[PDB]
Amino acid sequence: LSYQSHDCSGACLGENPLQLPIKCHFQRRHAKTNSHSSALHVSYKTPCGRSLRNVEEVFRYLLETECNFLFTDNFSFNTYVQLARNY
């Protein structure tokens, strides 16, 4: 999901509600630090390649893309939630 520099708009854009963004071509990404004791950070990548850090930025992205069909609980930033397994 390569990114080309742009301002997001509408053109950028199920048994398990956690899988709905993945069906809409988002990715859920788990970043592993190189700290001796490793930390994980979850991010989402959008269909247009934007990276989202948190639910506030998900909200911003859904506002910019005029998306009425994804909601706060379609997303999780919890490093121990597996979308396939924790529903």
């Binding site: 390569s2 990114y3 080309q4 520099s5 993945i22 990715q27 859920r28 990404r29 788990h30 970043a31 592993k32 630090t33 190189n34 700290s35 490793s38 930390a39 950070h41 991010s43 990548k45 390649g49 934007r50 990276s51 989202l52 850090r53 948190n54 930025e57 911003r60 597996q82 979308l83 396939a84």
Partner: protein, 68 residues
């Protein structure tokens, strides 16, 4: 010790790299709340003491840091 300088450039090479680990990325994040950069992930790169070794796509590929 620091991995990045006060501007979020790598100390080792001086390069300005996106935390998505695509070395060629322009910066795919919204402006970082701490420094404004579109290359900072969950934590600002400026003076940061770590980098991401890899990114795992859920259901997908592992992406490795090309520089480490």
């Amino acid at each position: 010790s620091k991995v990045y300088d006060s501007q979020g450039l790598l100390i080792f090479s001086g390069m300005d790299l996106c935390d998505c680990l695509d070395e060629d990325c322009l910066g795919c994040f919204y402006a970082c709340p701490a420094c404004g950069s579109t290359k900072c992930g969950a934590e600002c790169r400026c003076d940061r003491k770590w980098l991401y070794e890899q990114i795992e796509i859920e259901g997908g590929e592992i992406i490795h840091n090309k520089h480490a």
